[PDB]
Structure 1
Amino acid sequence: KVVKNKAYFKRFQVKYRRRREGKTDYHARRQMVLQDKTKFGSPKYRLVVRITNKDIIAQIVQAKIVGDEVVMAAYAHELPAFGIEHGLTNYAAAYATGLLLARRTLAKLGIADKFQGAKEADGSYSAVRTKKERFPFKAILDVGLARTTTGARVFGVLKGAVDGGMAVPHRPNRFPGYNKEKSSLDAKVHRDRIFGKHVADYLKQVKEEAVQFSKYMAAKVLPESIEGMYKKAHAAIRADPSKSLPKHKSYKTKKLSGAEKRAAAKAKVAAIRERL
Structure 2
Amino acid sequence: AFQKDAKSSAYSSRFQTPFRRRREGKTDYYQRKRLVTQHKAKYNTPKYRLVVRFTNKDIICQIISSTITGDVVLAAAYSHELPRYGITHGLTNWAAAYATGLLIARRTLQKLGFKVFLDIGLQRTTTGARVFGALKGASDGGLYVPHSENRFPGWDFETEEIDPELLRSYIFGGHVSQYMEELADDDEERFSELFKGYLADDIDADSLEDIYTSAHEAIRADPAFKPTEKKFTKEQYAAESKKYRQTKLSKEERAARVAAKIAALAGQQ
Q: TM-score when scaled to structure 2?
A: 0.89
Report 1:20-169 matches (<5 A): 20-110=23-113, 137-169=114-146
Distance 1:3 1:80 in 2: 52
For residues 118-176 of structure 1, give each alpha carbon's deviation from its aligned partner in whole angstroms, at most 9, with x where no partner exists: xxxxxxxxxxxxxxxxxxx1001110110001111111000000011000111111111
- How far residue 38 of structure 1 moved from its aligned partner, in angstroms, is 1.6
Counterpart amino acid of residue 8 in structure 2: N
Superposed CA deviations along residues 229-272 of structure 1, whole A, max 9, x for unmatched, are 11111111011111437632222222121111111110110123
2:211 corresponds in structure 1 to 229
Structure 2: 5+ residue stretches without partners? 230-235
| 8 Å Cα contact 1:49-1:59 kept in structure 2 | yes
Distance in structure 2 (CA, Å) of the matches to 1:245 and 1:216: 27
**Match of residue 202 from structure 1:** 179
Quote the residue 1:218 is aligned against. Answer: 200
Q: Which residue matches 1:273?
A: 266
Contact kept? 2:94, 2:171, Cα under 8 Å? yes
Partner Cα separation in structure 1 for residue 74 and residue 122 of structure 2: 22
Q: Contact (CA 8 Å) 1:81, 1:243: kept in 2 or not?
A: no
Deviation for aligned residue 1:2: 4.6
Residue type of the alignment partner of 1:167: Y
Does structure 1 retain, via aligned residues, the 8 Å contact 2:86–2:215? yes
Runs of 4+ in structure 1 displaced over 6 angstroms?
A: none
- Residues matched between the structures, number: 250
Whether 2:161 is the aligned partner of 1:184: answer yes
Moved more, 1-10 or 219-228: 1-10
Say if 2:107 and 2:223, in contact at 8 Å, map to a contact too.
yes
Specify the SS of the correspondent of 1:74.
Answer: strand
Instruction: Give the Cα separation in 2 of the matches to 1:4 and 1:261.
Output: 26
- Contact kept, 8 Å, 1:78 with 1:245, in 2: the verdict is no
**Partners of 1:261 and 1:23 in 2: CA distance:** 36
CA shift for structure 1 position 39? 1.5
Taking CA–CA contacts closer than 8 Å with sequence separation of 6 or more, which of the two structures ends up with the larger relative contact order? 1
Partner of 1:72, secondary structure, is strand
Give the fraction of aligned pairs with identical amino acids, expressed as a percent: 54
Question: Which of 204, 223, 226 does residue 241 from structure 1 map onto?
Answer: 223
When normalised by structure 1's length, the TM-score is 0.86
